[PDB]
């Protein structure tokens, strides 16, 4: 790790992009010439990079699948271009909705049929083994009607998957998400959507991590225009949309994927074993290769320009960095971040990194990776440890406080999307187990295990939200403690969609207790919008009492008190504060609307006195019941 090196290297490649291409703007507009394009003159212009092809051709429905009638002309640097002249009758050469294929001929004599790396749209017809390359030329394009929202003060991310966003056991649509799921997200107080599994993946059960077509918005959920309408509608509501970018590896599919494009093992990827990820059975990009930079950077630009995304989450950053560290992978990520922020400084980039790479989330100008945030991955693990291995009486308050406050800006989350999956437990499941199925009805008794589960689900989320980071993340359903698990159709379940859905109706059912966990989430995010603790400096922790099981801190002027004690309810408990005067309850997890016992009267005025307590100048006395969290705001006398 030499920061002077990381910059000098980046600075050089960027300088070359300027001398060789016309700067990173021009360089990242590769999607404008590569692929298949209909010209204003009625002709068709095509361009590809196939360095190890003897010949390249265009075939499809349009030419009665004659493989060699349209040969591309070879250019320098292993690139090929084709211009089919316009029709005499002045009609479309390649009709919209029709099938296409690139024909690659090898030195040996193999005749290979490929989908262009640059393909905009791909569809799997009924029960076909492979995806077909569908030419996209609609009568009307989607015109974006709304402007990008003002950059949020603090991010409150709602991690979403479009397919599973309905109560039905089927792939839900972009249209369904736009009409039914966007208003729910807005209502909860979330100001950002992390859109998962958008980049085309042939294997649905890969959760969007096995990419086949990099420039293609998954056909599965609908047309490219319906995704544009989705993003535009989110903007109409003041919600920013970020995309999950998988540039770490590629699916090894060759018929309908990026693998073996020009017939060799070294096109967009590394030759031999270096180019194969053994654990994932995937291909690995040759980040040193100029054309891989054009491809990957024109992809970043594509999602910014075509679909108007407000930023990205770069997945598999750890795997990219360690093949010792891959300098090329890292210089690619620096150029990607440089591009995103040069085009729009308000744009956000997040890194999915477990390693904790020094300066990954710091400015490039200081030898950093250029990322705005990293995910605070230690937080979900600490909650798992405590619920799996420790009795409530044995939870260390100092260890909770340490894990949450360790730090570079990070995104805090109580549980990941991976924890929602089959053969893993959600926080709601770790807390209530089999009782989740029995006593989540208002009509059944409020058992001590349902009572404990509800109280702790709220508290774990609130301490993660208030103390854990500079941003917050919640995966679809976990805001109301969604039951069961998530599982995608695959071999191992005989293609079942029974768990490939989200039961959102559970919160609308007044005869169920999910409404309580949902109400808490809505009010937690709305209170954050009002006071901005996520944007505030790190909290001042006055108390992390091992005996009493009390965590007390101040962030953005608010006073946060947590009683994790399984049985003791403290009266006249002294909490230190930096502010004198009157204090009022702004949030109480024991309120009835959240599934509490209503033990506290909110109309009570708490008066700060001049009594040094826990390194705080003033202190106030409070009633904090067992498994209750409180937020107190200082008010004008
Ligand atoms: O007249 C006085 C003047 O004379 C000299 O300079 C001459 C040059 O000698 C002459 O060639 C020309 O150079 C221009 C050139 O015409 C311009 O186009 C431009 O070149 C840029 C280019 O536009 C950029 O794109 C960039 O090129 C990349 C390329 O895009 C990228 O794909 C990659 O290419 C590699 C490829 O991907 C690989 O697959 C492989 O290619 C293989 C094929 O796979 C294989 O199938 C087969 O076809 O062979 C190929 C080659 O082995 O390798 C490729 C790389 O080798 O990388 C390149 C990066 O190089 O950059 C170029 C360069 O900037 O600009 C140049 C000028 O810089 O005109 C000038 C004069 O006008 C003399 O040198 C000078 O001092 C005198 O003043």
CB–CB of 257/202 below 8 Å? yes
- The protein residue whose alpha carbon is closest to atom 48 in ligand 1 is 78
Residue nearest atom 17 of ligand 1, based on CA coordinates: 20
Query: Does 291 contact ligand 1 (Cβ within 6 A)?
Result: yes
Q: Is the CB of 78 under 6 A from ligand 1?
A: yes
DSSP E strand boundaries for 510-627: 540-545, 550-555, 558-563, 570-577, 581-588, 606-608, 618-624
- H helix or E strand, kind and range, residue 410: strand 410-412
Nearest atom in ligand 1 to the alpha carbon of residue 74 is 48
Q: Which of 368, 214, 205 is nearest to 295 (CA)?
A: 214
**Binding site membership of 388 for ligand 1 (Cβ less than 6 Å):** no
Atom of ligand 1 nearest to the CA of 291: 32
CA atoms within 13 A of residue 533's CA, in its CB half-sphere: 27
Task: Verify whether ligand 1 is closer than 6 Å to residue 86 (CB atom).
Answer: no
Residue numbers annotated as active site: 315, 352
DSSP string for 530-552: HH-TTTSPPPEEEEEETTTTEEE
DSSP state of 578: S
Q: Which atom of ligand 1 is nearest to the CA of 53?
A: 46
> What are the CA-CA distances from residue 436 to residues 390, 439, 443, 562, 625 (Å)?
21, 6, 14, 24, 24
Does the CB atom of residue 71 touch ligand 1 within 6 A? no
Q: For ligand 1, what atom is nearest to the CA of residue 51? A: 44
Residue found by looking up tokens 């349009």 in the block: 62
Task: Determine if ligand 1 sits within 6 Å of the CB of residue 77.
Answer: yes
In this structure, the residue with its CA closest to atom 66 of ligand 1 is: 20
Minimum-distance ligand 1 atom for the alpha carbon of 52: 46
Gap from CA of 12 to ligand 1 centroid (Å)? 18
CA distance 17 to 25: 10
- Residue whose Cα lies nearest atom 43 of ligand 1: it is 78
If you measure from the C-alpha of residue 118 to the centroid of ligand 1, how many angstroms do you get, rounded to a whole number?
A: 23
**C-alpha span between 560 and 629 (Å, rounded):** 7
Distance (Å) from CA 21 to ligand 1 centroid: 11
Residue with tokens 């799996």: 388
Query: Which residues, including other chains, have CB under 8 Å from residue 505's CB and lie 6 or more apart?
Result: 167
Cβ of residue 51 lying under 6 Å from some atom of ligand 1: yes
Nearest CA to ligand 1 atom 44: 51
Does 48 contact ligand 1 (Cβ within 6 A)? no
- Going from the Cα of 82 to the center of ligand 1, the distance in angstroms, rounded, reads 20
User: Is residue 343 a contact partner of residue 310, using CB atoms and an 8 Å limit?
Assistant: no
Closest CA to ligand 1's atom 14? 20
The pairing of beta strand 111-114 with beta strand 35-38: unpaired
Name the residue of 17, 27, 77, 104 to mutate for ligand 1: max ligand atoms within 8 A of Cβ. 77
For residue 46, the CA-to-ligand 1 centroid distance in Å is 21
Could you tell me which of 234, 410, 215, 409 has the C-alpha nearest to residue 309?
234
261: tokens are 């494009």
67 lines ligand 1 (CB under 6 A): no
76 alpha carbon – ligand 1 mean position (Å): 7
Q: Are 502 and 482 in contact (CB under 8 A)?
A: yes
Cα 300 to averaged position of ligand 1 atoms, centre (Å) = 25
Q: How far is the CA of 120 from the centre of ligand 1 (A)?
A: 29
User: What is the Å distance from ligand 1's center to 57 Cα?
Assistant: 24
Q: Say yes or no: CB of residue 290 within 6 Å of ligand 1.
A: yes
Q: Which two tokens stand for residue 140?
A: 């009307």
Q: Domains plus CATH for the chain?
A: 1-28+142-535 (3.20.20.80), 29-141 (2.60.40.10), 536-637 (2.60.40.1180)
From the CA of 95, how far away is ligand 1's center (Å)?
36
Among 367, 465, 334, 479, which residue's Cα sits nearest to residue 410? 465
Coil, strand, or helix at residue 431?
helix
Distance CA 229, CA 225 (A): 6
Q: Which residues pair with 313 in a beta bridge?
A: 244, 350
Tell me the H-state helices in 241-326: 290-305, 317-321
Structure tokens at 109: 């004599």
The DSSP code sequence of 131-194 is -EEE----SSPPPP-SPPPPPPSSEEEEEE-STTSSSSSS---HHHIIIIIHHHHHHHT--EEE
**Ligand 1 atom at minimal distance to the Cα of residue 20:** 64
Q: Return the residue whose CA atom lies nearest to atom 20 of ligand 1.
A: 20
Grouping H, G, I as helix, E, B as strand and the rest as coil, residue 341 is helix
Closest residue by CA, ligand 1 atom 15: 20
Whole-number Å distance between alpha carbons of 408 and 471: 12
Measured from the Cα of 19, ligand 1's closest atom is: 64
Q: Does ligand 1 come within 6 angstroms of the Cβ of 54?
A: no
Nearest C-alpha to atom 50 of ligand 1 is from which residue? Answer: 77
Q: Which residue has the tokens 């040969």?
A: 71
How far apart (Å, rounded) are the C-alpha atoms in residues 141 and 452? Answer: 53
**How many helices (H) and strands (E) in the chain?**
14, 30
Residue 558 Cα distances to 31, 605, 622, angstroms = 49, 15, 15
Ligand 1 atom 16: the closest Cα is on which residue?
Answer: 76
Q: Is the CB of 288 under 6 A from ligand 1?
A: no
Ligand 1 center–CA 359 separation, angstroms: 35
Q: Position of tokens 């204090």?
A: 583
**Measured between alpha carbons, how far is 573 from 620 in angstroms, rounded to an integer?**
8
- The helix or strand, by DSSP H or E, that contains position 5, with its residue range, turns out to be helix 3-20
For residue 75, what are its two tokens?
């250019």
* Minimal-distance CA residue to ligand 1 atom 23: 20
Contacts of 16 (CB under 8 A, 6+ apart): none
**Is 125 within 8 Å of 171 (Cβ atoms)?**
no
């Amino acid at each position: 790790v030499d920061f002077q090196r990381r910059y000098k290297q980046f600075s050089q490649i960027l300088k070359n992009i300027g001398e060789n291409e016309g700067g990173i703007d021009k360089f990242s507009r590769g999607y404008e010439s590569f692929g298949v394009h209909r010209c204003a003159d009625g002709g068709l212009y095509c361009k590809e990079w196939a360095p190890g092809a003897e010949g390249v051709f265009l075939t499809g429905d349009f030419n009665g699948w004659n493989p060699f009638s349209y040969p591309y002309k070879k250019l320098d640097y292993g690139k090929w271009e084709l211009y089919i002249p316009p029709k005499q009758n002045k009609s479309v050469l390649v009709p919209h909705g029709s099938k296409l294929k690139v024909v690659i001929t090898s030195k040996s004599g193999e005749i290979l049929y490929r989908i262009s790396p640059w393909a905009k749209y791909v569809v799997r017809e009924g029960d076909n083994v492979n995806y077909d390359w569908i030419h996209w030329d609609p009568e009307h394009s989607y015109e974006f009607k709304h402007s990008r929202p003002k950059k949020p003060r603090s991010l409150r991310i709602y991690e979403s998957h479009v397919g599973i966003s309905s109560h039905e056991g089927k792939v839900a649509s972009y249209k369904h998400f736009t009409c039914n799921v966007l208003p729910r997200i807005k209502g909860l107080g979330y100001n950002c959507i992390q859109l998962m599994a958008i980049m085309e993946h042939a294997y649905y059960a890969s959760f969007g991590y096995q990419i086949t077509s990099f420039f293609a918005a998954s056909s599965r959920y609908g047309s490219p225009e319906e995704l544009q309408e989705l993003v535009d509608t989110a903007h109409s509501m003041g919600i920013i949309v970020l995309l999950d970018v998988v540039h770490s590896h590629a699916s090894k599919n060759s018929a309908d994927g990026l693998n073996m494009f020009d017939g060799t093992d070294s096109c967009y990827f590394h030759s031999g074993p270096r180019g194969t990820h053994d654990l994932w059975d995937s291909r690995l990009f040759a980040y040193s290769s100029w054309e891989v930079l054009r491809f990957l950077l024109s992809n970043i630009r594509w999602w910014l320009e075509e679909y108007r995304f407000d930023g990205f989450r770069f997945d598999g950053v750890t795997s990219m960095l360690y093949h010792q560290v891959d300098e090329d992978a890292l210089t690619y990520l620096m150029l990607a971040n440089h591009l995103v922020h040069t085009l729009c400084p308000d744009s956000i980039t997040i890194a999915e990194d477990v390693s904790g790479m020094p300066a990954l989330c710091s400015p490039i100008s200081q030898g950093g990776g250029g990322f705005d945030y990293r995910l605070a991955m230690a937080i979900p693990d600490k909650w798992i440890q405590l619920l799996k291995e420790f009795k409530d009486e044995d939870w260390n308050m100092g260890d909770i406080v340490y894990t949450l406050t360790n730090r570079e800006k990070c995104i805090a989350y109580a549980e990941s999307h991976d924890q929602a999956l089959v053969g893993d437990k959600s926080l709601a499941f770790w807390l209530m187990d089999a009782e989740m199925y029995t006593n989540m009805s208002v009509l059944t008794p409020f058992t001590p295990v349902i009572d404990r589960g509800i109280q702790l689900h709220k508290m774990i989320r609130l301490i993660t939200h208030g103390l854990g980071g500079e941003g917050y993340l919640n995966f679809m359903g976990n805001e109301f403690g969604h039951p069961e698990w998530l599982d995608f159709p695959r071999k191992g379940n005989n293609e079942s969609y029974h768990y490939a859905r989200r039961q959102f109706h559970l919160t609308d059912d007044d005869l169920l207790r999910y409404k309580f966990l949902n109400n808490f989430d809505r009010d937690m995010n709305r209170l954050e919008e009002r006071y901005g603790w996520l944007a505030a400096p790190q909290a001042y922790v006055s108390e992390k009492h091992e005996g009493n099981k009390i965590i007390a801190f101040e962030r953005a002027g608010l006073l946060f008190i947590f009683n994790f004690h399984p049985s003791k309810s403290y009266t006249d408990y002294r909490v230190g504060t930096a502010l004198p005067g009157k204090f009022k309850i702004v949030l109480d997890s024991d309120a009835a609307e959240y599934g509490g016992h209503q033990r506290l009267d909110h109309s009570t005025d708490f008066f700060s006195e001049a009594f040094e307590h826990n390194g705080r100048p003033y202190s106030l006395l409070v009633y904090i019941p067992s498994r209750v969290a409180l937020i107190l705001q200082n008010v004008d006398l």
